[PDB]
């Protein structure tokens, strides 16, 4: 199907404890492949997937140089944002940045993005035309003015439409065994009484890739959205994912309830039944 | 300031069989800000060699982390995950339940 | 790979 490359950057001020924390991670789809950690000893961009280890020394030296430039900008940004919002040195604050590109099943460019957040909420984001900005408040408007005058969007568009997709395709080919695979979920339902008149029905999906999946309960064909407990899709640790959805039902009504599983690795959506 | 509570899941990588080596996971997602303490417990005691994933975040900007260790389930050993975060008035302990 | 230009906010 479609594919994505995304870089995630987390920057955290640490009042009275010196330099801020800086963590960068890169993903292709749901597979991480690089990291940089300001608190680690190496001070290098490091591999986190087997298929990126084959990149040569120029790759690792260059990515280390560039991630440190990201770190330096974010270090300055924390001070700038203190000024924009008239905030004291006493509090810790969080900057997050995410950018990347998506391609379709034909591997052609679908969309690019670059999003920036301060203390957990939208700050500024590149719009989908890759030519203009959405500024979430008045402080972000200041950034917007500065980024328009410095033609930041034009350089970002060139990266997102060119470099980003070219290297995403390279990674997809070099790691095709890992990245171009689909593991269909292994599904079942469990049944456990919570009393003499009610039972928990839990619909399970295991060992699937990629992480995108939909689990739904129906009662006589009607969606049970408000009565379903749906846990966050979670990593198994081996490159696959797990998820479950549960309802609590009156004992004896089990046959009314069906679980429905959607995943791109299934030939067709699955319906699991108690009869 | 925005604060979001961690959603904590404790589970094994593979279906648990007594005496068979497995992996114990504590996945903590949806939290903000990023400072968080996560410990895996064996019979109430902190497990020493626990690794964790590199900090990342979801579309809504909330963070997620996987803590994990190799383990061999038994009949008697109780496993759990202990999480503290600014959104939690006290540390939260989630017990591993292998019969879900 | 990363983008090479990272302009300050
Ligand atoms: Na706390």
Residue pair A46/A34 in contact by the 8 Å Cβ criterion: yes
Rounded (5°) CA angle B14-A273-B24: 15
The domain A182-270 is placed in CATH, from the list 3.40.1160.10, 2.60.40.10, 3.30.1370.60, 3.90.1300.10, at 2.60.40.10
**Nearest C-alpha neighbor of A6 from the set A36, A42, A31:** A31
CB-closest option in A32, A98, A190 to B100: A190
Beta bridge partners of A117: A96, A122
Structure tokens that stand for A99 in this block: 């950018």
From C8, which residue of chain A is nearest by alpha-carbon distance? Answer: A73
Give the contacts of A267 (CB within 8 A, at least 6 positions apart). Answer: none
Q: Does A11 touch chain B (CB under 8 A)?
A: no
* Beta-carbon count within 10 A of A10 CB: 25
Residues A146-178 as b/e (b if ≥16 CB within 10 A, e otherwise) read ebeeeebbeebbebbeeebbeebeebbebbeeb
Judge whether A99 and A6 are in contact, CB under 8 Å: yes
Sequence-separated contacts (24+) of A104-111 with Cβ below 8 Å:
A104/A2, A105/A1, A105/A2, A107/A3, A107/A165, A107/A169, A107/A172, A108/A165, A109/A161, A109/A165, A110/A2
Please check whether the two domains, A1-181 and A182-270, share a CATH topology. no
Q: How many CA atoms lie within 13 A of A155 on its CB side?
A: 12
Q: What are all long-range contacts of A194-200, with beta carbons under 8 Å and residues at least 24 apart?
A: A194/A248, A196/A251, A197/A250, A197/A251, A198/A248, A198/A249, A198/A250, A198/A251, A199/A248, A199/A249, A199/A250, A199/A251, A199/A254, A200/A246, A200/A247, A200/A248
Using CB atoms within 10 Å of the CB of residue A48, give its burial: 0 to 12 exposed, 13 to 18 middle, 19+ buried.
middle
CA distance B79 to B70: 12
Q: How many Å lie between the centroid of ligand 1 and the Cα of residue A22?
A: 23
> What region, left, alpha or beta, does residue A274 occupy, with left being phi > 0 and alpha being psi -120 to 50 degrees?
alpha
Please indicate whether, in this complex, the C-beta atoms of A234 and B27 are within 8 angstroms of each other.
yes
Q: What is the DSSP letter of A46?
A: E
CATH number, position B37: 2.60.40.10
Cα A169 from Cα A107, distance rounded (Å): 7
What DSSP letter does each residue of A195-224 carry, written as one string? SSSEEEEEEEEEEEBSS--EEEEEETTEE-
Chains that touch C (3 or more CB pairs under 8 A): A
What is the CATH code of the structural domain delimited by A1-181?
3.30.500.10
Chains A and C touch (3+ CB pairs under 8 A): yes
CB A193 within 8 A of CB A248: no
| Length, in residues, of chain A | 275
d(CA A172, CA A10) in angstroms, rounded, equals 25
Long-range contacts of A63-70 (CB under 8 A, 24+ apart): A63/A34, A63/C1, A63/C2, A64/A36, A66/C1, A66/C2, A66/C3, A66/C4, A67/A24, A67/A36, A67/C2, A68/A36, A68/A43, A69/C4, A69/C6, A70/A9, A70/A22, A70/A24, A70/A97, A70/C2, A70/C6
Residue A117 in 3-state DSSP?
strand
Write the DSSP symbol of residue A225: G
Cα–Cα dist A174/A163, whole Å = 16
Q: Tell me the residues surrounding ligand 1 (ion) with CB < 5 Å.
A: B 84, 88
Cα gap A20→A74, rounded to integer Å: 9
In chain A, where are the structural domains located?
1-181, 182-270
Tokens, residue A196: 């003499």
How many CB contacts within 8 angstroms connect chain A with chain C? Answer: 45
Beta-carbon separation of A80 and C2 below 8 A: no
Axis crossing angle, helix A57-85 with helix A138-149, rounded to the nearest 10: 130
CB A257 within 8 A of CB A275: no
3-state helix, strand, coil in chain B (%, to 5): 0, 50, 50
| Cβ atoms < 10 Å from Cβ of A20 | 22
How far apart are the CA of B67 and the centre of ligand 1, in A? 19
What distance in Å separates the CA atoms of residue A256 and residue A270, rounded to the nearest whole number?
16
Residue with tokens 């991480």: A32
* Chain centre distance of CA A30: 7
Contact call for residues A10 and A23 (beta carbons, < 8 A): yes
Tokens for A211? 């992480």
Q: Are A234 and B25 in contact (CB under 8 A)?
A: yes
Residues of B with CB below 8 A from A8's CB? 56-57
What span, in angstroms and rounded, lies between the C-alpha atoms of A247 and A189? 11
Helix (H) or strand (E) run with residue A6 in it:
strand A3-12
| Count of C-beta atoms within a 10 Å radius of residue B76 | 7
> B15 to chain A nearest CA, in Å?
10
Kind and range of the H or E element at B66? strand B63-71
Structural contact between residues B92 and B31, judged by C-beta atoms closer than 8 angstroms: no
The domain total for chain B is 1
Q: What is the resolution of this structure in A?
A: 1.9
Chain A contacts of B13, Cβ < 8 Å? Answer: 236-238
∠ at Cα B26 (B23, B31), nearest 5°?
155
Task: Find, among B30, B25, B24, the residue nearest to B7 by Cα.
Answer: B30
From the list C1, C3, C7, the residue facing A150 with the nearest CB is C7
Contact flag for B and C (3+ C-beta pairs < 8 Å): no
Which segments of A104-196 are extended strands (E)? Answer: 109-118, 121-126, 133-135, 186-193
In terms of residue numbers, what domain contains B95? 1-100
Nearest to A224 by CA among A241, A203, A195, A242: A203
User: Is residue A202 within 8 angstroms of chain B, CB to CB?
Assistant: yes
Q: Which of B55, B100, B29 is nearest to A10 (CA)?
A: B55
Phi, psi (5° rounding) for residue B91? -55, 140
Kind and range of the H or E run holding A142: helix A138-149
User: Among all residues of chain B, which has the CA nearest to that of A232?
Assistant: B29
Q: How far apart are CA B13 and CA B77, in angstroms?
A: 17
């Amino acid at each position: 199907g479609s594919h994505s490359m995304r870089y995630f950057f987390t920057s955290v001020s640490r009042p009275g404890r010196g330099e801020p924390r800086f963590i960068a991670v890169g993903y292709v789809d749901d597979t991480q492949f690089v990291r940089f950690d300001s608190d680690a000893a190496s001070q290098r961009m490091e591999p986190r997937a087997p298929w990126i280890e084959q990149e040569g020394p120029e790759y690792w030296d260059g990515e280390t140089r560039k991630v440190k430039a990201h770190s330096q900008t974010h270090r300055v940004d924390l001070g700038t944002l203190r000024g924009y919002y008239n905030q004291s040195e006493a509090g810790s604050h969080t900057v997050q940045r995410m950018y990347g590109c998506d391609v379709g099943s034909d591997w052609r460019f679908l969309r690019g993005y670059h999003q920036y957040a301060y203390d957990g909420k939208d700050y500024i984001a590149l719009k989908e035309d890759l030519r203009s900005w959405t500024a979430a408040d008045m402080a972000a408007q200041t950034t917007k003015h500065k980024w328009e005058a410095a033609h930041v969007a034009e350089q970002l568009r060139a990266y997102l439409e060119g470099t980003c997709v070219e290297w995403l395709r390279r990674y997809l080919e070099n790691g095709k065994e890992t990245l171009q695979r689909t593991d269909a979920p292994k599904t079942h339902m469990t049944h456990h009484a919570v009393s003499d008149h009610e039972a928990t029905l839990r619909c399970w999906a295991l060992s699937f890739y990629p992480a995108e999946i939909t689990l739904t309960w129906q009662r006589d064909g009607e969606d049970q959205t408000q009565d379903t407990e749906l846990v966050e899709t979670r990593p198994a640790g081996d490159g696959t994912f797990q998820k479950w959805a549960a309802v609590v039902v009156p004992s004896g009504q089990e046959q009314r309830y069906t679980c429905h599983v959607q995943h791109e690795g299934l030939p067709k959506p699955l319906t699991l039944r108690w009869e | 300031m925005i604060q979001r509570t961690p959603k904590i899941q404790v589970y094994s990588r593979h279906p648990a069989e007594n005496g068979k080596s497995n992996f114990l996971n504590c996945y903590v997602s949806g939290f903000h800000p990023s400072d968080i303490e996560v410990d895996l417990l064996k019979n109430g005691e902190r497990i020493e060699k626990v690794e964790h994933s590199d900090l990342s975040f979801s579309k809504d900007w909330s963070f997620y982390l996987l803590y994990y260790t190799e383990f061999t389930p038994t009949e008697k050993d109780e496993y759990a995950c202990r999480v503290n975060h600014v959104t939690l008035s006290q540390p939260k302990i989630v017990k591993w339940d292998r019969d879900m | 790979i990363l983008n090479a230009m990272i302009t300050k906010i």
